[PDB]
């Protein structure tokens, strides 16, 4: 991710990075792998689009 800004601020509020964008952590491809259940979350998010 890149959330840079100039002046003393250069990051974005965690809260509004949990809204209609998300951010909290960033070390995915530097910590251990898994494959079965990280991809199911997205499929459950097809049931997040059911109404």
């Amino acid at each position: 991710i890149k959330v840079r800004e100039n002046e003393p601020f250069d990051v974005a509020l965690r809260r509004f990075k949990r809204s209609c964008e998300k951010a909290g952590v960033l070390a995915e491809v530097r910590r251990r792998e898994f494959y079965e259940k990280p991809t199911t979350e997205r499929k459950r998010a097809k049931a997040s689009a059911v109404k």
């Binding site: 965690r14 809260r15 949990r18 909290g24």
Partner: protein
């Protein structure tokens, strides 16, 4: 809880005109009774008056509102992860607590009477002989030097 619970308001000391003086009789409450408490209050008050022709009330006030408590550690949830949160103390409850302490400190100084205690004891304002100096060296020692957050 879900309500802030207190109780009735006590009356200000009526022959010196001062609520603080009346809340310190309460601290010294002996037999359950305010009476035998008020004696000694007044006895040691005079001791202080003799050495201090000016107000001897500002040697309670300074001493205890130099000391500004701030520390405990709790935890609450934030974004789906709980975190061990350090929590600040609100400036009002700092006050409320602090007034008590100094007068609590008596009946252990190994005197004969509460005269000799509370007299010599209370007179100091920043060079205390009471618990007020002795909590300073723990409150600021802790805080923001072994406390990771406000």
């Amino acid at each position: 809880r879900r309500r802030v619970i207190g109780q009735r308001k006590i009356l200000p000391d009526p022959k010196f005109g001062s609520e603080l003086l009346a809340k310190f009789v309460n601290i010294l409450m002996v037999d359950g009774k305010k009476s035998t408490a008020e004696s000694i209050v007044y006895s040691a008050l005079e001791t202080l008056a003799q050495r201090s022709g000016k107000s001897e009330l500002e040697a309670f006030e300074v001493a205890l509102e130099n000391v500004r408590p701030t520390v405990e550690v709790k935890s609450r949830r934030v974004g789906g992860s709980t975190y061990q949160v350090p929590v600040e103390v609100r400036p009002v409850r700092r006050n409320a607590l602090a007034m008590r302490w100094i007068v609590e400190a008596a009946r252990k100084r190994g005197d004969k009477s509460m005269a000799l205690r509370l007299a010599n004891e209370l007179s100091d304002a920043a060079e205390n002989k009471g618990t007020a100096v002795k909590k300073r060296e723990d409150v600021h020692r802790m805080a923001e030097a072994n406390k990771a957050f406000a």
